[PDB]
């Protein structure tokens, strides 16, 4: 019975780890996109100058 509990907890932990890793990857991508947007603003401002 205790082993069954541990098995369920292990599966839950694996799923949670997968979810957190995916979310972190998406967060990194989004931050990179934001930095690209800021660089775009600077480039555009030079062009308008």
């Amino acid at each position: 019975k205790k082993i069954e509990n541990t098995k369920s907890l292990s599966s839950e932990i694996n799923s949670l780890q997968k979810k957190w890793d995916h979310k972190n990857s998406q967060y990194n991508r989004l931050w990179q996109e934001r930095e690209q947007s800021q660089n775009q603003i600077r480039q555009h401002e030079s062009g308008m100058e």
């Binding site: 967060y27 931050w31 996109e33 934001r34 800021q38 555009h44 308008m48």
Partner: protein, 49 residues
């Protein structure tokens, strides 16, 4: 009010019109870049939560 002087002035006015249109286009680009940067910032904050 010579032919050459006024022709040059008119051509310069047309080219100024073109450059002004391009400038407004870049201004629009900057506007949307700023808005998207704001969007990404708040999205990233939520993602961190």
């Amino acid at each position: 009010l010579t032919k050459e002087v006024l022709g040059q002035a008119l051509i310069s006015a047309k080219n100024y019109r073109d450059q002004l249109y391009s400038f407004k286009d870049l201004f629009q680009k900057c506007l949307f870049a700023r808005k998207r940067i704001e969007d990404l910032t708040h999205r990233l904050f939520e993602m961190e939560t």
